[PDB]
Design a protein around this ligand. Structure first.
Ligand SMILES: NC(=O)c1ccc[n+]([C@@H]2O[C@H](COP(=O)([O-])OP(=O)(O)OC[C@H]3O[C@@H](n4cnc5c(N)ncnc54)[C@H](O)[C@@H]3O)[C@@H](O)[C@H]2O)c1
Ligand SMILES: NC(=O)c1ccc[n+]([C@@H]2O[C@H](COP(=O)([O-])OP(=O)(O)OC[C@H]3O[C@@H](n4cnc5c(N)ncnc54)[C@H](O)[C@@H]3O)[C@@H](O)[C@H]2O)c1
Ligand SMILES: NC(=O)c1ccc[n+]([C@@H]2O[C@H](COP(=O)([O-])OP(=O)(O)OC[C@H]3O[C@@H](n4cnc5c(N)ncnc54)[C@H](O)[C@@H]3O)[C@@H](O)[C@H]2O)c1
Ligand SMILES: NC(=O)c1ccc[n+]([C@@H]2O[C@H](COP(=O)([O-])OP(=O)(O)OC[C@H]3O[C@@H](n4cnc5c(N)ncnc54)[C@H](O)[C@@H]3O)[C@@H](O)[C@H]2O)c1
Ligand SMILES: O=C(O)c1cccc(C(=O)O)n1
Ligand code: NA
Ligand code: NA
Ligand code: NA
Ligand code: NA
Ligand code: NA
Ligand code: NA
Lengths: 410, 405, 410, 412
């Protein structure tokens, strides 16, 4: 479905732009695909052999960027589609990168921490010439973390010198940026703020229902709460909580960190999490799974705004139903781009040799998200299209323009 | 097919974990190759390189410009080059690459631009001591000149980066004849073990192209009797020996084989089953199948073509009494002389053709001796002696390099 | 000494932290030691041969950094201690460097300016592949100066292109930073302000005695005076002056620029310099020699605060005595760090391709000095220790953390 | 014993005075081009950390890329590595191969480390010096405590940083571009050099009895080559014990015993002897093949051999030289007699650079050619300066380095 949704959005946007068929063919072909043998000794000395890989989709706008997944199931169509989508997404928010996606076909549950280190270092040895601060910047993904990136940094720097900017998502001690925890949820709020200004409204005039309460939902709920927004309902995997007068989100957060489930929180009524998406509210924010809005519940959605924080929460069936009802849907490719934008800031700070304080990180995040919204809005006017297509046409057109300007002669 | 590797793996008793590593390629690469056509419209192709193993040296192998690309065939071919270089003890591993395109669709200016863009996209992955490409289906010495010229912009003047070059740009002498002459060097060595010489024998030769012409020529000069030669149009037969010098002369005059008066035209389907001591398939593979294997008058088959001998015949032959010099060794004269080209280039100083053929004879002779010894150690036929030898050298090189990071 | 002080502080700090002994062993082994032949023709054509050297102690937190000494008496134990100290010091103030120290065993008085240039250039030819903008960044030291740095820059750049960030201490015209002359004395005053903020106090109306009146003391006294502080005593090697109402420091500096003697200044009374450290004041700032506070005068100190600007002005006996008297000692490794901090800023400005104005240098210096004090203070609470151990444990732990995150597999 | 660098510098001073070298040129030639000490920290097999310091001393490169081995031995320290690196500079000039001198090592006991720990240590050391070595820069090789397997690991790790580079190290396995003849080269060169010396007396290896200290790469192949030429090897020692037979030890049987993990003291074809008595054994020829400084003022007067062939580097210190000279003992110096190894290393490097290997007949033919030329040059130098063999070789090599240094010049 990453392939499904990305191909649907690409093909719609290509038709709106009237992209030349042969240019389109080139844009769908990855710059480079790499597979390398990664063999290490286990702690007891016996050999294990894996295949590492990196799909480098496009670099017309700058170095490639994307996660390293340590996971046993590798679908090449999915890896390829997510690298492509990162190319479009970086273009939507105007950060100077293209897309890439990589990983190792392994199960890290079966590897000791020393084996995981050796594996990471060997993988880095096999691809050091194909990545680089100005070439391809890896990041964490499923099965990898900031410790993984520290090992890439350390091994890479043997081949090319000290190079903090070669990976993002590093530990603070090795050049990681401040503000990364909050970046995605705070970015969702920044985007929502720019959207509501088009109506001369602000966060404080609105009620909100939030599906999911993890990294994205907690910080979004917090940033909404601090700006006057009333969060009337919140769900997660195990329950849901409701209050028409707004939930005290600071109290809810502290009830969470104390290991208290949503349903048995005092400042609200327990509700059925299956009712959250059709809950009475102005604004619905899916922050959990994709595919949650479809033909079966779209007609019962009450919000007038849907802020797509999760990946692909709205099926096309529901997209069309919801637009007809006049529902305004801020698309995922834009709305959840706070995380990737701050990872750009990490790279900048490393390149600059000089880290930013958190206030500057968040001022630049606000500036980037607001400008992207204005650019999306201007594209909707140009093409008389919805926000989702305003975004994809914006990102696709920037990649096409950069590609056409670079040209093709040898 | 993995049959030969699997057979040899079990003779050697290769460790399962080592075997798994040896089958995973070092690196597989695919790159976009987009060029403007002569009319400025774009065309996009995918170039690729499978770099199987470099335990024993830089990788080596052809670049195919051909539309049908099957990744499993490309991988098998890169792997076979790793074993084959090890059989004749030249310091390379195996690779194979290409561009999925039909060169007949492209002008020569378009093919040059495509070759140069491909080189631009892989220049950091190849190199004199990393991976050395060569011609293959759809490419030739002009293709290699373009790669050399473009690669040298990135890394300086680097003649050794490709083989099969034009002579004017560092190509070696002796390349035409290398494979067919190497076939005759290999069989001279084989027959030595039984106290016989080329002159002592009669030869039937299937095919009369780059391999067949040179093989028959070199046999004729060593006193062998060539009594039957096949090709596509016709065939000729003379049971006391064809005058090859004249048979070639007659080919230079667009002359067909049947029209050769120095013998009697025969049915080309009646060559593999012609009466002779030695049969040398030099045209197609899969010519010796189960049914037609019984109808074989020769006691020696020198495998010049690739896989001329179906695996059915391998069982039979041995029963019928036939000694099979296997293709992986017997036709390796061509790859051996491509190593010599590389050597001459990095030495900055070309050899004369006498030296090329001296070294070719030395390399083929030692490889046969190394193969025969292995056969005694493991007590196997010539095909497995060779495959065990090549696999074992790659395994040994890999084990000596080690596994720690 | 400077070797025994560093050893004693490293040792005490390592035991507060509980550093594993194998980790400690690694940390005290330098990354790399270099000795190179440096042979030049003298102006008359005859040869002279010297040994140049560079100890590169640690790079877990970033490129190495440190001075180049042209001096005949080379003690390897001292050079090594000074490289290690720089590793701890840069960590105390969160600058992204490790420590190094180098030099040439020569006497610059014996050498003409053209001989010194050729020697500098040959030394650069012999070590250029071992240093670098992201590898090891030299600086002036005893027997060298900004002109020496210009020659290193010029010769290095023949091998690597224009590389202004490869050395600090450069001439302004070749990328040197503004603000370097005031940096250490101003940094002392920023550090003092951060300390007194913890008591709800500002410098104004507090009284200061200052031992030494050179680069550090003059700028410290000026920065104090401009902030309303009362500088009631100043001494140097030739005399001392006092005024209980506060010396007009502007006038005193004007007097000293006319080569006037401290004891002769008209806006005060001559005093015996031996009575400075025991003068009646709120704040004592040793800005001259080390070891000036020992067991046989520590009991007669009357200040409540000591701001260590000189290297090791307080021996361990005095430390002991003054703690038991209730005296608060801001330690040298932190308090005089403004000079090393501004040399970091020079490197930043060079990397960024754009020099800062002086207001910006001083704003970032105040930010770095304040944040470092806040981190030290917090460390004192964590480990229940004094400011000196709070600073050393802070720097040593940052190096250890970075080393452990980087890991040990090859 | 005497400090190895004090000893070697004394020999350097004496040779400089024979040559009348300019004082400022002498001072420059003494000082090494580059000395490097690096931290080498690895996890052990159980995961715990151990830290060593590694050394690469690059003494002089006027005559070409620098050259010398890597020693893994507990006594490796800066003085020992500096002494060895300087001797490499003189020795490469003696045989006139286009190299300068370097040496490296790690203070460790390989006996105490597993094979995977030795591979990790070797790989980390290579990570720490890869930027200092190179085909045309500095070319290592195996010394005490290392072998061709160690070199394979250096080759493999180095090639990650600079691409496949067979000629970056010599002493490689044959499977990875090593030269036929290299493993046997130092022992065979010792025999070529000894035959040249004994011929000046009309004598042959078969006229002599031999005692050998050390039974590693040098001692084994030296014993084998002597044995195959009819020499009577009457005593052999190593670190664990020693064996003696006045009628001559069957060296082929001793090597088979060694191959089977047997100890010298247990070999049935001889009598166990105290290794501490090897150097004063009654023999015609003493060949030290182990550590340096082992002939000193404390035992030199008790040497009974009439010839000493220095297969080890710097086994005889200057005090012992004087004592032995007054006893009428002739010493074939390390800088000539043991140069077969670095000479065949040169051939290995040449073969790698040429991408085309030689057969063993050619290797050994060129080795004998180089050793013959050098002995004749040494003889001439002894006559010119009326000096002993050590100074004949030392001044030969020192003079060649000086000439090359003067040609290259001093401006920046
Ligand atoms: N594309 C991007 O760059 C990007 C960035 C960040 C997050 N996201 C998307 O945001 C979503 C959440 O990410 P996250 O980091 O917050 O995850 P997380 O794991 O931190 O939190 C997920 C939350 O969703 C809840 N949840 C899971 N299944 C649920 C269900 N069926 N009903 C209700 N609640 C459910 C969990 O209990 C938890 O509260 C995902 O779609 C993720 O892919 C996208
Ligand atoms: N593995 C290697 O490195 C290697 C090297 C060189 C050649 N070869 C093999 O050698 C064989 C021939 O190569 P070549 O260079 O001589 O080819 P070529 O194209 O120069 O000539 C091939 C000849 O085969 C003959 N021929 C073709 N179809 C025939 C048919 N149906 N019946 C009888 N004869 C027929 C004709 O004489 C034709 O000219 C092929 O199998 C090739 O793969 C292998
Ligand atoms: N570690 C660092 O990064 C760093 C940075 C700068 C300075 N420092 C320390 O600060 C000290 C002072 O530095 P500076 O640059 O101002 O030196 P400076 O040479 O500019 O001035 C030294 C001053 O001390 C006075 N003085 C010397 N001996 C004296 C004595 N016995 N009694 C009284 N006054 C005496 C001199 O007359 C002069 O006023 C340095 O020596 C060093 O200890 C440390
Ligand atoms: N390997 C070469 O090519 C080469 C070349 C020229 C010179 N050398 C010199 O030869 C000497 C030996 O080198 P190697 O390669 O044979 O080393 P190795 O590690 O292969 O063997 C050294 C031998 O010395 C023995 N030994 C160690 N300490 C001893 C002691 N105290 N008493 C007696 N025996 C002892 C060991 O047990 C072993 O038998 C060294 O001086 C070395 O520098 C080596
Ligand atoms: O091949 C070499 O470089 C080498 C190796 C070990 C010792 C020596 C030596 O001491 O000459 N030279
Ligand atoms: Na593309
Ligand atoms: Na283990
Ligand atoms: Na493999
Ligand atoms: Na260290
Ligand atoms: Na002059
Ligand atoms: Na020197």
């Amino acid at each position: 479905n990453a392939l499904v949704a990305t191909n649907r959005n690409f093909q719609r946007a290509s038709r709106i732009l009237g992209l030349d068929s042969k240019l389109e063919k080139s844009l769908l072909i990855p710059y480079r695909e790499i597979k390398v043998e990664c063999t290490i000794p286990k702690d007891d000395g016996s050999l294990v052999s894996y295949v590492g890989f990196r799909i480098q989709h496009d670099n017309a706008r700058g170095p490639m960027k994307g996660g390293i997944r340590y996971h046993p199931e590798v679908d090449p169509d999915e890896v390829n589609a997510l690298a492509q989508l990162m190319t479009w997404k970086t273009a939507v928010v105007d950060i100077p990168y293209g897309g890439a996606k990589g990983g190792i076909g392994c199960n890290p549950k079966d590897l000791s921490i020393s084996e995981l280190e050796r594996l990471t270092r060997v993988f880095t040895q096999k691809i050091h010439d194909l990545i680089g601060i100005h070439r391809d910047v890896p990041a964490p993904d499923m099965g990898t973390n900031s410790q993984t990136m520290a090992w890439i940094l350390d091994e890479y720097s043997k081949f090319h010198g000290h190079s903090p900017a070669v990976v993002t998502g590093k530990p603070i001690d090795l050049g990681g940026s401040l503000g990364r925890e909050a970046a995605t949820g705070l970015g969702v709020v920044f985007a929502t703020e720019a959207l509501f200004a088009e109506y001369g409204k602000s966060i404080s005039d609105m009620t909100f229902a939030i599906q999911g309460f993890g990294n994205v939902g907690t910080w979004a709920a917090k940033a909404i709460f601090e700006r006057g927004g009333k969060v009337v309902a919140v769900s997660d995997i195990n329950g849901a909580i409701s209050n028409p007068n707004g939930i005290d989100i600071a109290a809810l957060l502290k009830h969470k960190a104390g290991n208290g489930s949503l349903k048995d929180f005092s400042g609200g009524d327990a509700m059925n999490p299956n009712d959250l998406l059709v809950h009475d509210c102005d604004v619905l924010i899916p922050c959990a799974l994709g595919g949650v809005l479809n033909k079966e519940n779209a007609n019962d959605v009450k919000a007038k705004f849907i802020i797509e924080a999760a990946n692909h929460p709205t099926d096309p069936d529901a997209d069309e139903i919801l637009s007809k009802k006049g529902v305004i849907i801020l698309p995922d490719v834009y709305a959840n781009a706070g995380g990737v934008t701050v990872s750009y800031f990490e790279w900048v700070q490393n390149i600059q040799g000089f880290m930013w304080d958190e206030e500057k990180v968040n001022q630049e995040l606000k500036r980037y998200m607001t400008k992207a919204f204005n650019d999306i809005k201007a594209n909707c006017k140009t093409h008389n299209c919805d926000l989702r297509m305003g975004a994809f046409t914006l990102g696709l057109n920037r990649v096409a323009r950069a590609t056409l300007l670079r040209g093709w002669e040898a």
